[PDB]
A = this chain, B = another copy of it.
Amino acid sequence: DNLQQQNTAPQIGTVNSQGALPGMVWQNRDVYLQGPIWAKIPHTDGNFHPSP
């Protein structure tokens, strides 16, 4: 949170929604026997990791 000093105790904060960071690693949601198969990627200019 802040800059600790001799008269100032350090403080923290809980992050609840973090965007992407260089070095991140993750997996995709699993599929199911009665679930979907595919889905059309929208036709835009920009997207990021297009997995339904």
* Residues of chain A at the chain B interface (Cβ within 8 Å): 1, 13, 15-28, 42, 44-52
Contact = CB atoms under 8 A, between A and B. Distances in A.
Give the oligomeric copy count: 6
B26 A22 contact: yes
Contact of A27 (B19, B28, B46, B51): B46
Contacts of A25: 42, 44, 46-47
A50 B23 contact: yes
B45 A24 contact: no
B20 A48 contact: yes
Contacts of A17: 15, 18
Nearest to A14: B1
Contact of A48 (B21, B42, B51): B21
